[PDB]
Design a binder for this molecule. Structure first.
Ligand SMILES: Cc1cc2nc3c(=O)[nH]c(=O)nc-3n(C[C@H](O)[C@H](O)[C@H](O)COP(=O)(O)O)c2cc1C
Ligand SMILES: Cc1cc2nc3c(=O)[nH]c(=O)nc-3n(C[C@H](O)[C@H](O)[C@H](O)COP(=O)(O)O)c2cc1C
Ligand SMILES: Cc1cc2nc3c(=O)[nH]c(=O)nc-3n(C[C@H](O)[C@H](O)[C@H](O)COP(=O)(O)O)c2cc1C
Ligand SMILES: Cc1cc2nc3c(=O)[nH]c(=O)nc-3n(C[C@H](O)[C@H](O)[C@H](O)COP(=O)(O)O)c2cc1C
Lengths: 333, 333, 333, 333
């Protein structure tokens, strides 16, 4: 595999159509899904030359731990859909690559089993109709050694996924929500979680500047600037188009991550040049899992690590902080 | 049906080519027809998160009545072209959905019959060579219980519809103008109508800012920002591209509606975020009528209602007024 | 024929390939040829409503004569390439439509014969290596009753026409330059022509603002804002993209015409809304000549007249001057 | 051959696929490769008319020598891949056209042999792990009569060339680096070269404004504004998009060249109108070499010279300095 697109092709060959569509699809007309790619494609980096590259490092410190790359595996529900080892395959590969892995509330293997793999596990939270269930998930995660709570704030309910409707998609009987209904979360919910844990709370799905500022005021440790991979509001702006404005507005008050469409180390570099602390990567990790299980994910992470190092150095950046000081230019197509 | 595009496909299957072309077509090269879609596709919404969605409502008050959605059925002439029940099928479905229905001066069933269906009927007026005929239509409408007069101001004469010319299109003998020649309307005409009725007068086909302001000064109750679905001036700006400027200029002096290309609840949300009080929907209603008669229109209205509620909530809006306070970003393709 | 594109199709059917390519082609990669169309397609008009249209007139006064439309036939060399009656067919049709016809220095029928047709003939001048020949052409034109001298200033030499090179195109023996070598013209040349005639001198091929201003200072009666239909510098800006700036800079000091890509009455309206006094139309006139001779050109002029009247009225304009006060908006694709 | 694209077609016919891919390809997704063309295609020139063109000259003075055109042959490694005479064929053709030829550190014929051809040879330098080897190359070049040192500053290491990876590309045994490992160069390296030679040092691969300014401060004689033909950082801005800003910032302190995508004399004119002193041309020179050896390169240089003269004169420019005073407009597609 020499690009992440080689893994998409390999996953499409192996997965059943309806599962590939569950993975690939977005809501509505898929405008926001396509826009995540378009938005990245229009950003160009202005690289710097002639800097010292004797010790290029792709490491960052985030939520109190060193990560090997400015990247984490996004929360993706029901990974046993893609490979029989599901979440444990991905978590093992992430651990070995030094990348944080986000354990999902809708994981097909229990959060305690995945946490036992080791590494840098984070935990993603959905707010539930029964509040106490959500707060119990948080305590379970913390007790199991998760290092951050990624509170998904863009899913008062699931978006209209027309591929899934047309396919009549349903989980196979062999895939379940192993940690066991959505309720709209509010700012009250955020405070309840903040009060119930000592871990950093990261709000995932922020796009408005004022919501970023309010997240900082609310005591978030981070936000993920995200339109949920185009799966929630069809017509929501891509996160990459809001990122620079949001970075400026929080002015170092919390970590600012971005997701949606990251498909190369060069895309990681674009995101950092626009001000991101780190990115999440979703679909490509699942492509690698589907294609080749744990080894597939390992190969994908190795490929991304190589592409990030290559892009950084070609742009004159010996560290991620230097990459954040790069300038960009918007171009056409 | 899971999208409005499923209904287009179904209507194209059933209607004779020349009638489908009468419905689908625009004037000239169809540049303004295509632009209505392009203009919407470039608008992205910046959604808000973590708001109270306990009682999301899609209702509005307009022209003194509560409507179930910020939407009305646009005036479309000669609906018996599409289904034998024509206007009565559409009006019944609109009534049952709680959506206003605009009765046309060129209706293929008389305005009194359609008004007798009930619901929230509005009446669309063409100015005629014989003025007294136009003013008699207005009094007929008012006597029949219509609630607003939608004065079409963009049709001094009909545009050049090349599909209709190439097809040699003419009304079948079984379709007539049941209420029974265009004369250019002027501001004088508007005043004559304003003087002859107690109903709100809504000017449909406004695109210039100064004409919006003048409409308010003239005592209009509303305007529809519209290029007549690309059927009048070929090269006229889409209404969606003028809407925000117009909303700012009238500064709450009348209701500001928009039409042209609305094809989903997400498009309704875009229009409201740009400042619209409500939208009109034309072609899709006729697709649903052609495909499945009254039941078809009912299914379309149910689908739109679901998509509007979904988009609003995903964008953090418990009411249409909140949706009007959303911000937008122009994007590419 | 219901659009000008119907005539292109008809001309392509009848003309030999190499002659169609002589007509259609541009220089180089044809970027400027394509851009003339792109530039018009991105301009949208903001129409006005509810104005008095009792006496819509498409007439203008230009160079001391009334013209039936804000349009003239562009200078196109060697019209016998397209039809055996060549220039006389086109000039007769123009005369009968009330449109000025530009007689070319490279006409395939002598300028005195074409002038004898009557109508509103203008004369286009190429500066020649032998100056006296050019000044003798001017006196011949004036003696024959031409009403303006259209001095082409963008042809120090002919551009690189790759279609013609690839085809090995040469004039048939039956087509000659009937008035009988290019020399670069300068501002000195313009003055020599201004001194030798009482007719208005119109500089055709101006694109820079400062050259427009200098044209006024030099005593020009008009300019044509033009990239020579994409046939001269490949990469020259379209005239339509410079027009508004140029109109502002001359501030009524001379007539400002535009050409390049005008293919409908709506395009004429766009040009006038951007400030043009009138347009020239080239290729379409030759399509009509090739398809059907004099009658073809007559039908094209009738179609354009209808489309101009239609566009004007739909935009609320009872006169060309009102059309020049319309505003425009740049849109996408 | 009537355009440079005729030579691409001819080279593709003759070269083995993997060698054509070595030549054509870029790094990563090839976004920067495509963008070099897109960026040029959106620039339009505003030509001037009616200037004296009695003695149009395409000559420039650069690095103390007169060049016949504002163009040099870019450094391209391993030219024996394309034709058995390799670099000597190209250098001979360049010499005879009066164009500088850049001898590469990775030349497949020794730099002394190519310099012995005569003409205006420049020498391109890669910094090596062994510094002394790089400084010895510089002295060799100077001793052999090269006139400038073109220090490539964008290759701390080679970019990820996916075509070459997929093809398993390797040099044939019959092609070697005849002058005989990359080390990242720094500003220290530049100073070491500046101290070791009396020749002008030209930094190739500058894109950031501040790096241009620093190059002047460092005593560079020139820079080449360049993304290495899209072969280095995938997502690097095209040089043509930075050129005007860079020209303004150095404010005549060094020569500012540009490369990437120059495919015609009109493109040369665009580059000069944006402020370039001269351009480099890479791929097209190799197409001509592959197609027809020395004679091919001669024909390409003759074609470019004709197109540059044609574009200049059509734009009203009797000299390159006048071309640099042309204005431009950004257009669409
Ligand atoms: C199949 C699938 C399932 C997902 N499940 C969740 C989830 O349970 N929780 C969540 O916060 N995001 C979920 N996401 C969104 C991702 O975390 C992420 O925002 C999105 O995939 C990023 O874009 P990318 O896939 O383009 O890299 C899911 C995404 C996909 C494709
Ligand atoms: C077949 C057809 C007939 C129409 N007849 C009328 C009419 O009689 N009066 C009027 O004001 N608008 C008429 N319109 C314009 C619509 O009211 C509306 O402005 C346009 O259809 C909105 O765009 P949409 O179809 O893209 O939703 C007609 C539109 C169509 C497609
Ligand atoms: C075949 C052909 C021949 C032309 N000959 C001349 C000419 O002799 N003199 C001149 O000033 N322009 C000449 N032109 C340019 C036209 O006057 C005009 O600028 C151009 O055709 C306008 O664009 P249009 O063809 O897109 O309408 C010629 C154009 C064409 C297509
Ligand atoms: C096959 C190939 C090999 C190259 N080798 C070198 C090199 O050895 N040194 C260098 O500075 N640039 C090298 N370049 C980059 C060119 O000098 C130049 O920047 C690029 O080709 C310009 O773009 P163009 O090919 O679009 O004209 C190479 C380019 C190509 C296509």
């Amino acid at each position: 595999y020499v690009s992440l697109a080689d893994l998409e092709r390999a996953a499409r060959d192996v997965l059943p159509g309806e599962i590939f569509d569950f993975l690939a699809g977005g809501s509505g007309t898929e405008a926001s899904l396509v826009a995540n790619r378009t938005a990245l494609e229009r950003v160009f980096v202005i690289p710097r030359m002639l800097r010292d590259l004797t010790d290029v490092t792709t490491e960052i410190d985030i939520f109190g731990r060193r990560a090997a790359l400015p990247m984490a595996v996004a929360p993706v529900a029901y990974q046993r859909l893609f490979h029989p080892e599901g979440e444990l395959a991905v978590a093992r590969a992430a651990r070995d690559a030094g990348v944080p892995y986000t354990i999902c509330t809708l994981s097909s293997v229990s959060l305690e089993e995945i946490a036992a793999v080791g590494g840098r596990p984070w935990f993603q939270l959905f707010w539930l109709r029964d509040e106490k269930r959500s707060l119990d998930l948080v305590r379970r995660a913390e007790d199991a050694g998760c290092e951050a709570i990624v509170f998904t704030v863009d899913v008062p309910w699931m978006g209209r996924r027309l591929r899934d409707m047309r396919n009549g998609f349903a989980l196979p009987e062999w895939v379940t929500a192993a940690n066991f209904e959505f309720a709209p979360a509010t700012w009250e919910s955020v405070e309840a979680v903040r009060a119930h844990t000592d871990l950093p709370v990261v709000l995932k799905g922020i796009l408005a500047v004022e919501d970023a500022r309010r997240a900082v005021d609310a005591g978030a440790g981070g936000i993920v600037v995200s339109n949920h991979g185009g799966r929630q509001l069809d017509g929501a702006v891509p996160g990459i188009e809001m990122l620079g404005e949001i970075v400026a507005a929080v002015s170092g008050g919390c970590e600012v991550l971005v997701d949606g469409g990251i498909r190369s180390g060069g895309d990681v570099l674009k995101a950092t040049a626009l001000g991101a602390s780190a990115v999440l990567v979703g679909r490509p990790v699942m492509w690698a899992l589907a294609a080749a299980g744990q080894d597939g994910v390992r190969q994908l992470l190795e490929l991304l690590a190589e592409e990030v190092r290559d892009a950084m150095g070609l742009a004159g950046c010996e560290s991620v902080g230097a990459a954040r000081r790069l300038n960009t230019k918007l171009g056409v197509v």
